[PDB]
Design a protein around this ligand. Sequence first.
Ligand code: ADP
Ligand code: ADP
Ligand code: ADP
Lengths: 552, 568
Amino acid sequence: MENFTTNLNQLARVGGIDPLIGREKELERAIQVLCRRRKNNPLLVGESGVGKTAIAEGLAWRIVQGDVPEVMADCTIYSLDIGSLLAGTKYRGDFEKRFKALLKQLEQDTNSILFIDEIHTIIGAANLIKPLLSSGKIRVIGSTTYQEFSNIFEKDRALARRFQKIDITEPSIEETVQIINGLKPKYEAHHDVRYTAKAVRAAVELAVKYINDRHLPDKAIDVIDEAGARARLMPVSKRKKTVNVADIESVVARIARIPEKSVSQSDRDTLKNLGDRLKMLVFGQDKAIEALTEAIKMARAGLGHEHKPVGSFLFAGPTGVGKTEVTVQLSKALGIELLRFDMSEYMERHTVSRLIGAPPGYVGFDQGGLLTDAVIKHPHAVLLLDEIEKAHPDVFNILLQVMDNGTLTDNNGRKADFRNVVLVMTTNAGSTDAMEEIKKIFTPEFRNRLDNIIWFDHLSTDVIHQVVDKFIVELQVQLDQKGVSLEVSQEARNWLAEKGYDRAMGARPMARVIQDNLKKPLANELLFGSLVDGGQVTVALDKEKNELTYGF
Amino acid sequence: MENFTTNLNQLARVGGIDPLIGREKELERAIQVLCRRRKNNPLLVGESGVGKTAIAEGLAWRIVQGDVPEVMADCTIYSLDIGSLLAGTKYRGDFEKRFKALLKQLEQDTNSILFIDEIHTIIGAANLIKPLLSSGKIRVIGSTTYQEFSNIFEKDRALARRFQKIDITEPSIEETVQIINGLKPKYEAHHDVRYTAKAVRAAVELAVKYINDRHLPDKAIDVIDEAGARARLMPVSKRKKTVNVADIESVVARIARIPEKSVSQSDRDTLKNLGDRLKMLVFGQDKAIEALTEAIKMARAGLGHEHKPVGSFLFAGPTGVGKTEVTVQLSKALGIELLRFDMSEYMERHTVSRLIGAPPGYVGFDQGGLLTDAVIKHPHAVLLLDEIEKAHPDVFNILLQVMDNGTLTDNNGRKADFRNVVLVMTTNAGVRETERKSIGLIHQDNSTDAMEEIKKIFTPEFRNRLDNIIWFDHLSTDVIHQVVDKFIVELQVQLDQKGVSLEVSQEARNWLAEKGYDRAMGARPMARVIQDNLKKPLANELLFGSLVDGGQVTVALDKEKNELTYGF
Ligand SMILES: Nc1ncnc2c1ncn2[C@@H]1O[C@H](COP(=O)(O)OP(=O)(O)O)[C@@H](O)[C@H]1O
Ligand SMILES: Nc1ncnc2c1ncn2[C@@H]1O[C@H](COP(=O)(O)OP(=O)(O)O)[C@@H](O)[C@H]1O
Ligand SMILES: Nc1ncnc2c1ncn2[C@@H]1O[C@H](COP(=O)(O)OP(=O)(O)O)[C@@H](O)[C@H]1O
């Protein structure tokens, strides 16, 4: 095996192997398994990036250090390269020849162990070692995921009985702190930096909160190494080597595809003026913004509940008052995604399965869910549900279980975390009369689970003028990107506000009115070339025409 | 030896390497990745020829200029030229002994970084770089594309725990112009010609609508090279060093073989008169054509949302009135391709997955979905989705997502550009309700408005995003007469090619037109009725001795409303 495997004893004795911390229980289990006469083959069951490989390295380290029982001494752990072993054969006899050469070079040392990292690729071959590792001469250290184990193992019972499953789980928060503490000095030596304990704990907690593609002990080490690299690059500004919590938050936002610094302390600057910058983007219903921002700050302060969503908000009031506008601006401010669903399509009995997914064996199972799928895709978004009072009661039971426990289960068994989303529900139901109306239509078991009910009052005529001026200034800045100025007379604004607004529809027709009255005429003048770079658009209302006139 | 490992730092010092234009944040990412103690091997994923070698050359140059932290300020970089070590052996043992020799040589050359061009092809002598992975003390920068990345790296833990993908996107228009200007003086020296900044500007602005082979910073330079070569070679006695935008469009017409006058010399002229251009080829539906042209013009004006698609229109009304022909002539007028899909085949979600390119449902998910690859091939084309009311509601979800954001990502790390695509769907829903016979003694009882059935079929979430909803009316008697006359002249061409002349009375044309027109299918049964009423008796005569090689047949009607055949 001179060219097929790596002598891990020769490697832990020189360097590169890092000390394994907090795995005394699993190491003892692997040792106890290795002391058996027959079937002394440990199998490490875990997931990607949990430190399965670190177990074998720590075992080789304790071997070369002598921190093992004397029965376990003198053993040599070999890590084979499957690239050299399996690939490049291309014929019916070469792979078995390589395999038998490896087995013979293992036979000369009856106390040596072979460790095959990720042993699910060589198996599906496997019938060549089942009689060798059954009870005869060879002990093998296996490392697989739970999925690869439950898929390839447990089917070949002859191989399931020839291996000892060692349940490697991901370490807890404090164990991650201890592991990264033990691993700190090496990165400090490489990057010539220093990590504060506050930065360490913050990095672990932020990796848990935002980075959900890997598991704890590896993504945490990755974020510290990345912070160390960033602080080693910072001498382009000739800064100090200390790595604080700010660098950790920056690198976290860099990695989790999250807006920069939108995680811990710039959030203080945003929540300082959250209600204000909302009231500059939404007009009217300002007490609604006040209560909503109050609840948002209440949740962000760390005083909320972990087994409930960030907030369960009901937006009661007539349409066109900006509930969706409040929601989308809340999403844009906090740098979180937006999830939008309309319960108009889930009012039927059979439609409920579209959210979580059909049970196995039925149509649309491999489609998975839509709610749980989006939530797993974007765990920090704000959930928007239009017309909740239309949803079929099964959707209401789903939402009840969500608001009560803050987690959902995909039809593939995955866990959808809702503790980081803001559950926002809007209705077009709508004061005390609106409250009594809400008591009717909504079951008390649902209302009792709500965080806060937010009422949206009717839009006032000055507010309609303000929103039409908002449309006008948006069109103005859009034209300024083109380079054409625009004038709109006051009576034109009043006519647009009165014509595009309905008490029963709110400001919804305002987009259509703005478009068909302003963009069309101006688009003709601009594209056909009558109005060019340097013109100024005028808007005049004639009561004898009720139309808008213009010029160059 | 040095014939296998090339230090490009010397190339940067001797002026052989120019500084890189832009993409400095990719340099910073690569540097901080090379700074790591573990997983310190950068990987460049992206399109082929977008400046990955250029990124590495600019990074090595910056190290020469010392634009890096003090840890890698003195480090040297090496480029791997596999061909030199590979060729000249033709012996597996010699191949492997050369591999060992180069491994020992680079290990002696420690404290250096080796750049592997197209590492995806080196990994798949796969046992040549595995010594570098097992050693780990050597940093390596590679280059790969999304296809090869998804094929090799995402399934291998030994590679994932070493490499980090650097998503290199194609630069903006102005960044491409900056790169063109940076590479311009040496080519002006080589090609002995002079191009303006407006010349290369119109060059890239034309390439973006001619590019169907490779992205921006891999083709505009080739356009410039072709322009220089032609301007130096096209005239024998003249040497037109002045290379203007007319020269660029001449090269575009010379290479793409589309007439420069139809695409490059017409920027807005056909757009300003698009409506009459369509009305000239489609008989009738003038109101629908006018509405469509006004909508697409309002879109082209640019006073809207740049992310949204060019146009999203639902063509309602009975089929067989030319809505597909309207779309065909719209595609031909804009000079853009026609990407069409008959939504009758996507009534099942396991086919919607194939439409998008979801991993399950279809083999070959490395190539992505149909719609995404199609819009990638032509980011300027028109989209036709017939019978849109048949598609699965997930197609409606995707259409809502596109009409909301104007971009569709793929499960292979690619994006779809819709901001230059116009989407057109056709349906005939509700038109079946215009022929619903009432119960009363009169039972006309309606000129049905299919709008209610339309809003019933398409959820308000979807149709709320329509840029317009175009309604197509019934074809007029003159329109039906023109279309039956077109069928007639087609039959006449066929018969004269056979050698038989044909004549038809105008009354017979009116009869065929008024008989073959169905308010449910428009003029589609016209081909069939023309066939059954004309081609059958003429074929009977053509085979049974009345006419064999030549002859002439006239057509007329009786008082019984029957076709009358007149033989030789
Ligand atoms: N208890 C620990 N002590 C020291 N390092 C650890 C510990 N647990 C995990 N690590 C580190 O986290 C990383 C885990 O990588 P690894 O488990 O080998 O990947 P995979 O499980 O996918 O094969 C390693 O860098 C490892 O050193
Ligand atoms: N309070 C408001 N302030 C500013 N604009 C508003 C407001 N309410 C409605 N609008 C305008 O109406 C359009 C969207 O209305 P929407 O939020 O969908 O109504 P609703 O949430 O009640 O269904 C937008 O053009 C928005 O600008
Ligand atoms: N105004 C017209 N000008 C020319 N041909 C027409 C016209 N109206 C109908 N036709 C003929 O009837 C056909 C109707 O096609 P269409 O309604 O688009 O169905 P499809 O979905 O298969 O494209 C046209 O292809 C054309 O041959």
